[PDB]
Amino acid sequence: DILAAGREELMAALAEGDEHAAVDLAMRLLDGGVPADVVLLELVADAQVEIGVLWQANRWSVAQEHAATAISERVIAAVGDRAAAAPTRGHVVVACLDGEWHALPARIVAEVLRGRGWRVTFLGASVPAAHLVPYLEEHGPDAVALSCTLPRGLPRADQVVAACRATGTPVLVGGLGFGPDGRWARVLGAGTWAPTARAAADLLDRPEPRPADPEYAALRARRAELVDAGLAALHEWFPPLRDYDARRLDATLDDLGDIVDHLAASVYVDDPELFGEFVTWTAEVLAARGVSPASVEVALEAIARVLDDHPRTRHHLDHGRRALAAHLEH
Amino acid sequence: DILAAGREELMAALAEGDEHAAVDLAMRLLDGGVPADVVLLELVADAQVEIGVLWQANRWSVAQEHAATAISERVIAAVGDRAAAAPTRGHVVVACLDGEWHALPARIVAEVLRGRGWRVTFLGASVPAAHLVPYLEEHGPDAVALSCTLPRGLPRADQVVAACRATGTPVLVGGLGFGPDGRWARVLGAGTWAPTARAAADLLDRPERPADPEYAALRARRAELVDAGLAALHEWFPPLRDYDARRLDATLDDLGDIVDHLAASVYVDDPELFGEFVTWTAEVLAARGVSPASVEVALEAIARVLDDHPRTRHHLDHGRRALAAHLEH
Ligand code: B12
Ligand code: B12
Ligand SMILES: C=CC1=C(C)/C(=C/c2[nH]c(/C=C3N=C(/C=C4\NC(=O)C(C)=C4C=C)C(C)=C\3CCC(=O)O)c(CCC(=O)O)c2C)NC1=O
Ligand SMILES: C=CC1=C(C)/C(=C/c2[nH]c(/C=C3N=C(/C=C4\NC(=O)C(C)=C4C=C)C(C)=C\3CCC(=O)O)c(CCC(=O)O)c2C)NC1=O
Ligand SMILES: C[C@H]1O[C@@H](n2cnc3c(N)ncnc32)[C@H](O)[C@@H]1O
Ligand SMILES: C[C@H]1O[C@@H](n2cnc3c(N)ncnc32)[C@H](O)[C@@H]1O
């Protein structure tokens, strides 16, 4: 189709950092009868996933991604400066979770909803619940749409969703943070999930008590201890650490913290496949940057030792180690 | 003065969270002969400062600011989808420092440069030097334009500017992070500063050391110093005793920020950085029902620990004097 050609031309503009070409392409596609929603979901969204794949593989830098993403935002704005219908359906507030800076997925949702006649107030990146809740109380929208892209944000998602529901505002949720097929929204009972902006719009067209886990609490309270334990194990087993400068040591510490935090998220939703997928993803990220993924196994074994009398955490760690071992046999 | 009226109408749209009205206003102003640069600098920029004032005073929430800022971004895009000239002058890369997420000031610079015929690649928020440097080596732009809004980022700015210069790329710098009249850029010799997008464009139209041990100590001992501040608050500041996890975390975050701004102040050896930060902090906290006297408690505790660091000691003294003076009026 013209969509194959459109994707190639769009990626070429994004890779070149050429905002005018990307926007002009989008406008010409609209002029030729390509639906706005198709430009946003089949062209822009698809390009952004691929940019992520390239970054993950260390084939693109952060600068290259940033250039592209900013242009994709301009494409989304240009397309919405044309496809938006007069607001006749009601009012939706679109917000990212506190600590969630992937605004572009949420912007696509906002634009698609506007195209169907919703009045949308877009709040975008990182809205604290303490500020979002009074905003919902102030304006009483028909729905709040909460976007989460990182599964590590799932504990926060659960809290923010609960707080929003307590205002009586219907909650829609989405983004990659709930998993590609919405699994972690369903596990949490977190609002109504949908996979895409199109599906969100379809939902809106219809005629329509959580005890703390001490094991999760321990992963938060003992984070520094666990990072330190991982580092000490790397000191014993992983030779490159001995020659790391400040920058590489800081990256190691950052990554160790992220390992603990994803383990915490996995335990929170009690789905070991969160930690499993995280560990295999981490292996790919590190390998692509010349860091042996065996380093991860060293850290996981060390954390498992410290927490071996925490049965749920132990199970998740075991699952992570098995997933890594399986990944590394290729 | 259509600009007085324009400002009122714009702020009304922003306060209402009405993107269509704000964009339509901008377009009507352009249609009536208001220069694009005027819409961006005299209307949009001015509104964003005022949103900052309202937030600082706890009169606007984060949600209210976020709604407004996203609309201002759409105004900037709409105005640039009209005012940008064909690229004929050369190539500028526009980037925020690593850890700097105020992209909008940099977007205004980008749009104004495009209006003067520059090809601009906008990288926006938070670009690590390790990624920016190879990008500059790859593309050899005529300049890189670095934006910094938070003075706490100044030590990083100094390093990133040096790294960019080492690629042979001329560096322009700006944003609030370089201080009043660019003072902190100028004392460091960190690139060529300019106050506004207009002035940046004007510059482009022309024919063109030992590590700091006191700074190092403020970074290395950050946790210790936060803890010292907290222990003093425990001894002297009654509300802390009744704080839940959330308020305790906010206290800890703020104490860290106090240390980090002290580090920046010492780094550029300008006590007025720390002084202005402390008085700003007092206003922020007071507006949220937290006694600014709490800040004095923390500062006195940090001064005790670091009393044999002469530069740091001086900056802390200056901060305490600035706070005392602020609190008598
Ligand atoms: C651009 C980008 C960034 C940008 C985003 C800026 C912006 N303006 O949004 C920046 C640079 C800020 C960024 C930062 C980071 N990111 Co990033 N980034 C991306 C990237 C490449 C594209 C995102 C995008 O544009 N999505 C647009 C399209 C693709 O979204 P979409 O899913 O089709 O959207 C639909 C659905 O999600 C759904 N939906 C979404 N929200 C909602 C809400 C509701 C209510 C409903 C019903 C539906 C719904 O409907 C949408 C529209 O149809 C992705 C790759 C990816 N696969 O997403 C990563 C990716 C998400 N990032 C990733 C990472 C790791 C990071 C960082 C941690 C990196 C770092 N160390 O700094 C940080 C974290 C920042 C934070 N705290 O959030 C990883 C996350 C992997 C993981 N471990 O979970 C990814 C997946 C890349 C990868 N590794 O392959 N990132
Ligand atoms: C919008 C906003 C945000 C948004 C920004 C999103 C975005 N898309 O940019 C978000 C929510 C992300 C944000 C976050 C925060 N912010 Co804020 N925010 C603002 C606000 C209200 C407006 C910024 C803006 O739109 N500027 C547009 C206009 C006003 O910029 P301008 O100065 O006119 O731009 C010109 C010049 O600076 C110059 N220039 C700028 N860059 C360059 C570069 C070059 C090369 C040149 C030549 C010139 C140049 O030319 C420009 C164009 O003419 C300001 C208020 C303010 N006074 O700026 C604060 C403000 C900057 N934020 C502030 C704070 C404290 C924060 C947070 C720390 C809050 C928090 N705890 O989360 C974080 C920090 C995030 C980070 N790490 O960077 C404070 C900082 C005070 C301080 N201590 O330094 C301010 C001053 C608000 C206040 N207190 O009054 N913020
Ligand atoms: C357990 C052992 C372990 C070690 C030894 C480790 C080290 C490590 N990680 C690095 C980078 C990195 N590591 C990550 C990983 C992540 N980014 C994210 O946002 C998330 C969630 C992850 C995953 C945990 C990334 C993306 C970089 C590259 C940083 C950059 O942009 O330059 C680097 C720098 C690479 C270089 O400069 O050569 C080192 C040394 N990480 C580890 O986990
Ligand atoms: C020394 C004593 C000291 C104390 C006791 C302190 C406490 C403190 N600061 C708070 C919020 C806050 N404190 C800040 C301050 C900042 N935000 C920034 O980005 C920066 C740089 C600052 C300044 C340091 C802000 C903006 C909030 C509001 C956070 C929110 O909205 O949740 C709160 C929560 C208020 C409430 O919910 O009732 C407390 C308790 N801060 C202190 O510094
Ligand atoms: C998911 C996206 O996050 C971006 N990314 C990775 N590390 C950083 C960083 N330190 N600062 C800003 N953006 C970053 C990458 O460009 C990636 O594509
Ligand atoms: C400078 C701007 O930073 C925003 N701001 C303050 N705290 C947060 C936060 N936790 N998350 C996101 N934005 C925030 C405010 O809305 C302010 O206006």
Residue B172 pairs in a beta bridge with B145, B192
Q: Give resolution, Å, one decimal.
A: 1.7
Residue A193 pairs in a beta bridge with A173
Closest CA to B305 of B264, B270, B255, B269: B255
The letter for the amino acid at A160 is V
Question: Could you tell me whether strands B143-147 and A119-127 are parallel, antiparallel, or unpaired per DSSP bridges?
Answer: unpaired
Please indicate if the annotation marks A99 as binding a ligand: yes
Alpha carbon nearest to ligand 1 atom 17, residue:
A102
Q: How many CA atoms lie within 13 A of A164 on its CB side?
A: 33
Residue A174 pairs in a beta bridge with A147
Inter-residue contact A220 to A133 (CB < 8 Å): no
Give me the phi and psi of A17, to 5 degrees please: 65, 35
The answer to whether the CB atoms of B66 and A134 lie below 8 A apart is no
CA atoms of B275 and B32, how far apart (whole Å)? 45
Q: Which residues contact A52 (CB under 8 A, 6 or more apart)?
A: A65
- Which tokens go with B268? 């550029």
Closest CA to B136 of A5, A74, A67, A41: A67
What 3-state DSSP class applies to B53? helix
> Which residues does chain B have within 8 Å of residue A123's beta carbon, measured at their own beta carbons?
63, 66-67, 70
User: What's the gap in Å between B65 CA and the centre of ligand 6?
Assistant: 8
What 3-state DSSP class applies to B326? helix
Q: What is the 3-state secondary structure (H, E, C) of A53-117?
A: HHHHCCCCCHHHHHHHHHHHHHHHHHHHHHHCCCCCCCEEEEEEECCCCCCHHHHHHHHHHHHCC
Q: Which residues contact A84 (CB under 8 A, 6 or more apart)?
A: A111, A114, A115, B20
A143: left (phi over 0), alpha (psi -120 to 50) or beta: beta
CA atoms of A276 and A112, how far apart (whole Å)? 33
Q: Which residues contact B103 (CB under 8 A, 6 or more apart)?
A: B96, B124, B125, B147
Q: Which residues contact B169 (CB under 8 A, 6 or more apart)?
A: B136, B140, B141, B143, B144
CA dihedral B73, B77, B79, B80 (to 10 degrees): 130
Show binding-site residues of B for cob(II)alamin: 48, 73, 99, 101-104, 147, 197, 261, 280
Interface of B with A (CB under 8 A): 17, 19-20, 23, 61-64, 66-67, 70, 74, 77-78, 81, 84, 95, 101, 121-125, 127-128, 130-132, 134-135
Closest CA to A197 of A97, A273, A122: A122
Question: What is chain A's Cα-based Rg?
Answer: 22
The letter for the amino acid at A159 is Q
Please indicate if the annotation marks A66 as binding a ligand: no
What 3-state DSSP class applies to A3? helix
CA atoms of B119 and B124, how far apart (whole Å)? 15
Question: Could you tell me whether strands A143-147 and A119-127 are parallel, antiparallel, or unpaired per DSSP bridges?
Answer: unpaired
CA atoms of B34 and B3, how far apart (whole Å)? 9
CA atoms of A117 and B74, how far apart (whole Å)? 19
